[PDB]
Every structure is written in structure tokens, then in C-alpha cells.
Design a protein around this ligand. Sequence first.
Ligand SMILES: CSc1c(NC(=O)N2CCC[C@H](C(N)=O)C2)c(C)nn1C
Ligand SMILES: [Zn+2]
Length: 139
Amino acid sequence: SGAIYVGNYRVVNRHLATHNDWANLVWEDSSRDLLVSSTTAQGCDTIARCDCQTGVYYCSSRRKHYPVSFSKPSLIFVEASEYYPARYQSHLMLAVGHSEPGDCGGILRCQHGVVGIVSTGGNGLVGFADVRDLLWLDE
Ligand SMILES: CSc1c(NC(=O)N2CCC[C@H](C(N)=O)C2)c(C)nn1C
Ligand SMILES: [Zn+2]
């Protein structure tokens, strides 16, 4: 679990969004596993605006942060689950690292700010849903 709080927005994994998220929906994209809902309280997370391929992510199944090299946001095949049929997930970045179910929502950060959140895992690989292209999160 986990979310990004920036301005009047909350960014979460779409497959983990609540009734409240859906009732205050701003934007969602099933192909990205992202949903953005509105909040009354102001958020202070800074979003990175860069092409960094190195950063640190939070892994809740180990209660530890890990430094990683990660790929550029791309269309990657993702296996069927209780949330989605087998499909290509877009804007996804992979890194060699640990992740298990329950890790989704952990933030990936570089020196510039928040890059994305854990969205996929398995086979010693962790996938992050990129948020750096969502320029409207700042305004
Ligand atoms: C999060 S780590 C993980 C998962 N979770 C996923 O990769 N998933 C499951 C939740 C939805 C994700 C998506 N973006 O479609 C896909 C699994 C099935 N094994 N391991 C080790
Ligand atoms: Zn960066």
C-alpha cells in the first residue's frame, strides 16, 4: 500500500483505489495502473521532472529502502491477476530488486523528487508506474 500526496491530489495504484478515491476521481488509466483522486488537505510531495534512471524505492515487505537502476517508461507485458487480464502496461519501468504482493504503492525517488510508485513484481524484478509526465499534478 501507499500513495503520493501533491497539492490537492492523491495518486494511488488504480487496483488499490478506495470508494472515496472513486467518488472524488480526477483521472484514471487502467493501462498505467494509476488513479488520481482529490483531497481537501494540501500535499507536499515534490514530483521529479527528469529522465533519471537511478533512484531509491521503499520496499514494505523488507521495511527498507533500496537503491536501483531502472529502465525508461515503456509498454511491458503483465500477467493476469484478480485485478486485470493479461495485458501491456504502459509507462512502466523495471529494476532488479525485491518486491512481493503488498509492496505496491511504495515510492521511487531520485534527487529531483518522486518518480513513481511500485506497481508490479516477480522474478527478482520490480516495476514502477511512472508519474513524471503528469505535469498537471503541480497546477
Ligand atoms: C507486487 S510484487 C508481485 C505481484 N504483483 C503484480 O505484479 N501484480 C498484481 C497487482 C496488479 C499489478 C498490475 N500492475 O497489473 C500486477 C505478483 C503477482 N507477484 N509479485 C511478486
Ligand atoms: Zn531525477
